[PDB]
Amino acid sequence: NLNRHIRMNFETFRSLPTLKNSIIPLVATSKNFGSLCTAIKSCSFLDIYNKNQLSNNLTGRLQSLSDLELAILISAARVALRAKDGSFNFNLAYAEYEKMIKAINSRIPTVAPIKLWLKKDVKNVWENLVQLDFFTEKSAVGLRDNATAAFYASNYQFQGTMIPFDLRSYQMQIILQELRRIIPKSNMYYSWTQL
Amino acid sequence: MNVTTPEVAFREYQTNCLASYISADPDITPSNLILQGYSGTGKTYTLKKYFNANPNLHAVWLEPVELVSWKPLLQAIARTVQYKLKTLYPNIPTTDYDPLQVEEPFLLVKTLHNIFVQYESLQEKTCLFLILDGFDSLQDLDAALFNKYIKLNELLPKDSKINIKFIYTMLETSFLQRYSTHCIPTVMFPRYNVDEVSTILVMSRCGELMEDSCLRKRIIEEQITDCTDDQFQNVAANFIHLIVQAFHSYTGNDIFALNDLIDFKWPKYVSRITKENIFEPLALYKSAIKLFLSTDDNLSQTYDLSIISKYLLIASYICSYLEPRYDASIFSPRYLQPSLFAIERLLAIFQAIFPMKANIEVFQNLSELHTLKLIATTMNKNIDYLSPKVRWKVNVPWEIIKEISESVHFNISDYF
Amino acid sequence: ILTKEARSYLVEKYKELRKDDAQGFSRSSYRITVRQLESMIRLSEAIARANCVDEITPSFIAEAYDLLRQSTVTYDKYVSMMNMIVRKIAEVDREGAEELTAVDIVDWYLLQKENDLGSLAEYWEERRLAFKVIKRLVKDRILMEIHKTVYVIHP
Numbered sequence: 178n179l180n181r182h183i184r185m186n187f188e189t190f191r192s193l194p195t196l197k198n199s200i201i202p203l204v205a206t207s208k209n210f211g212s213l214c215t216a217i218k219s220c221s222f223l224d225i226y227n228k229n230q231l232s233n234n235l236t237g238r239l240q241s242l243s244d245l246e247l248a249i250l251i252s253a254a255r256v257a258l259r260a261k262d263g264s265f266n267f268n269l270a271y272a273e274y275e276k277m278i279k280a281i282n283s284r285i286p287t288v289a290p291i292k293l294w295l296k297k298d299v300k301n302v303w304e305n306l307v308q309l310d311f312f313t314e315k316s317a318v319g320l321r322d323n324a325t326a327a328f329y330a331s332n333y334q335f336q337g338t339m340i341p342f343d344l345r346s347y348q349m350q351i352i353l354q355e356l357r358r359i360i361p362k363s364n365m366y367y368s369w370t371q372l
Numbered sequence: 373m374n375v376t377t378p379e380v381a382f383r384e385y386q387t388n389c390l391a392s393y394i395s396a397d398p399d400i401t402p403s404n405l406i407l408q409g410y411s412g413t414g415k416t417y418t419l420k421k422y423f424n425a426n427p428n429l430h431a432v433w434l435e436p437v438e439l440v441s442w443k444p445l446l447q448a449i450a451r452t453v454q455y456k457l458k459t460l461y462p463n464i465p466t467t468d469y470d471p472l473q474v475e476e477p478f479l480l481v482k483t484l485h486n487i488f489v490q491y492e493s494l495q496e497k498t499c500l501f502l503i504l505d506g507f508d509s510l511q512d513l514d515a516a517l518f519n520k521y522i523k524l525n526e527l528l529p530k531d532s533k534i535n536i537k538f539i540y541t542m543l544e545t546s547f548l549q550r551y552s553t554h555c556i557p558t559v560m561f562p563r564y565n566v567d568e569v570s571t572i573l574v575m576s577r578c579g580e581l582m583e584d585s586c587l588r589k590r591i592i593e594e595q596i597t598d599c600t601d602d603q604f605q606n607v608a609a610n611f612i613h614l615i616v617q618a619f620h621s622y623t624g625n626d627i628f629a630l631n632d633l634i635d636f637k638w639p640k641y642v643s644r645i646t647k648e649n650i651f652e653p654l655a656l657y658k659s660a661i662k663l664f665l666s667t668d669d670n671l672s673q674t675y676d677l678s679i680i681s682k683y684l685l686i687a688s689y690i691c692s693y694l695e696p697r698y699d700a701s702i703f704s705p706r707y708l709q710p711s712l713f714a715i716e717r718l719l720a721i722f723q724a725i726f727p728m729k730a731n732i733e734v735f736q737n738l739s740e741l742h743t744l745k746l747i748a749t750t751m752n753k754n755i756d757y758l759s760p761k762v763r764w765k766v767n768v769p770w771e772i773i774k775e776i777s778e779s780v781h782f783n784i785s786d787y788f
Numbered sequence: 789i790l791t792k793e794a795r796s797y798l799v800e801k802y803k804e805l806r807k808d809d810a811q812g813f814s815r816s817s818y819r820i821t822v823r824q825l826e827s828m829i830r831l832s833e834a835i836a837r838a839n840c841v842d843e844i845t846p847s848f849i850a851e852a853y854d855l856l857r858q859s860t861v862t863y864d865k866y867v868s869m870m871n872m873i874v875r876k877i878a879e880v881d882r883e884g885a886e887e888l889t890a891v892d893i894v895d896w897y898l899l900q901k902e903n904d905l906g907s908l909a910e911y912w913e914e915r916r917l918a919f920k921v922i923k924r925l926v927k928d929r930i931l932m933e934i935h936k937t938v939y940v941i942h943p
């Protein structure tokens with residue numbers, strides 16, 4: 178198992194200190210010689226280390242979202258896909274969310290004698306998704322490279338920070354195809370991962 | 373060398389990783405260490421929880437959240453390290469260096485070197501865990517900053533008995549990915565699951581709410597006789613589960629927002645408690661229903677405006693969302709941001725829609741609207757309305773223009 | 789022949805269809821017109837004409853409403869279970885009846901479809917199929933559990 182992991186390391190990246198730093202926890206955590214031998218033979222804890230290295234990636238963040246957050250993400254992705262430039266805003270996202278809720282309700286037959294959340298409550302969901310970097314502002318440079326660039330950036334006032342919360346332009350990081358790859362099919366909103 | 377490990381729930385892997393990379397011998401610890409996770413992940417909690425079980429580790433705590441820029445961050449390191457070294461080993465004769473003299477990282481290295489030389493008389497080599505919480509949370513931040521603290525202690529003389537062992541905490545993933553080639557030991561914090569958040573809130577904020585004055589009133593008011601602490605615990609616990617299951621799709625999985633919702637709704641939920649409400653929390657749910665039907669995070673005829681102002685704000689919306697092509701035909705893109713226009717258009721449309729000429733009250737109402745910020749301009753500082761370069765746009769949504777039109781009996785719904 | 793309450797229910801649904809078909813800014817609709825109001829009766833006539841009744845029930849108005857608006861477990865079986873259980877809970881809650889457990893909900897639903905079961909072998913499959921529907925509702929919080937648990941409509 179250790180040889181397989183070493184071969185994988187060699188194939189993937191050839192900076193040896195990376196493998197050194199990967200090995201260090203295995204030696205450090207060992208409590209007894211028998212435990213050390215069993216761990217180094219099984220060599221399973223490198224998989225745990227590697228998955229924790231991957232836990233805050235796009236898939237890891239996406240697996241933690243809620244139902245309403247996921248639905249709004251899907252609706253935003255649909256608008257981005259339909260757009261020529263991929264841009265979208267809060268108004269279009271909520272319009273699509275309302276439209277898809279209406280469609281889901283309609284496909285449920287009416288009985289002879291699912292909530293559309295209010296536009297104010299959806300603001301918290303939007304704020305959550307903007308911070309988790311699923312969205313991004315239209316031309317967000319993000320982290321500047323040097324102190325002088327940060328100075329000129331903090332001196333200037335971007336229009337995107339002044340215009341209302343409902344009309345800020347965003348672009349998408351996870352394209353709808355990636356969502357359909359990742360989103361489980363058991364999800365109720367999965368059927369809308371297609372156009 | 374051996375370090376005991378606290379049993380931090382839902383952070384066991386990271387507690388083991390901090391049992392690693394942290395020990396008494398500076399020859400068994402790295403020069404840099406990064407713990408990463410988004411807000412509300414427990415990194416500040418877990419790191420302090422681990423340090424609070426092993427006092428012999430000499431830790432120095434700083435927060436770039438308070439320290440606005442890099443100069444305070446540099447100066448605080450020298451100040452707190454010097455004070456901590458005095459607190460730990462006082463008997464050695466030392467001379468003070470002013471932390472306000474640290475204007476450059478080179479000067480920080482110089483001061484650290486001088487202080488360690490002053491402690492050279494120590495018998496054993498010892499660690500100094502300088503801790504920075506939320507490095508990327510620093511507001512005056514740039515990409516090149518972090519390398520300066522990555523590659524710092526190698527400029528120190530390795531003969532020194534005191535070795536600095538930096539620890540960083542970070543929020544964003546786009547910050548880490550610029551420094552992956554350095555192979556810095558990294559410990560990751562993923563967002564909690566719902567089952568984890570609910571149990572964390574139950575374990576943390578249960579007893580604090582359980583004995584608040586609001587219940588200290590209601591227990592006596594309802595003359596509860598057989599009450600015990602276990603009943604208090606269960607009744608308080610049910611509240612957190614109800615709020616979580618009600619507002620999980622709204623808050624998400626964040627502890628802070630759930631705590632705030634609990635804080636706001638707890639007195640009102642307690643108010644509904646009667647003699648028959650306890651020992652049947654279902655009735656408690658079935659009586660405080662309206663608490664669980666609205667978020668109640670709102671801070672509180674919404675606009676009461678003059679008629680001239682109302683028609684000016686109708687005409688401005690018409691200007692902002694009607695294409696200029698139609699001004700010669702109709703009078704003779706809602707989801708998009710409003711387009712700009714000129715005052716010449718606004719005055720003409722206002723004259724064409726009011727049921728007025730150019731008395732000063734019209735311009736006064738327009739300037740009042742601008743001061744109210746119901747209409748925006750293309751500038752931020754040194755407003756110069758009369759300059760021809762300024763352009764105007766609407767800063768009011770459609771839902772309010774509709775009510776204004778209803779209140780003035782106007783039919784904007786037929787112009788689009 | 790239209791029953792008197794069917795007229796009351798028809799005007800309700802025609803308002804609902806006219807509401808949905810309404811454009812966002814202009815009041816003019818495009819698909820639903822007065823002809824469609826006749827169509828609802830005309831379709832309801834034919835639907836009722838397929839069976840041995842000369843009295844249009846409110847149910848046959850809903851069927852025409854569905855067909856005109858539309859313009860593991862099978863999808864139809866899942867939703868059919870939903871509309872049956874969801875209205876059952878809303879009925880007893882609004883009427884303030886005694887609370888019922890998930891098992892009682894499953895037994896109630898199987899009682900409603902006694903004749904659709906071809907054999908007692910199919911009974912166990914449908915009974916097993918029923919709990920999956922419940923868990924899906926709880927999975928996305930369509931029916932909130934209150935701690936055996938009691939199910940209440942989510943906001």
Ligand SMILES: Nc1ncnc2c1ncn2[C@@H]1O[C@H](COP(=O)(O)OP(=O)(O)OP(=O)(O)O)[C@@H](O)[C@H]1O
Pocket residue numbers: 380381382383410411412413414415416417418506543572575576627
């Ligand atoms: N395992 C846990 N058990 C109990 N409470 C926890 C646990 N993990 C985190 N918390 C709670 O999380 C709360 C928020 O602190 P936390 O350490 O998560 O902040 P943070 O993510 O470092 O914040 P910031 O980025 O704003 O500095 C604490 O008050 C603590 O009670």
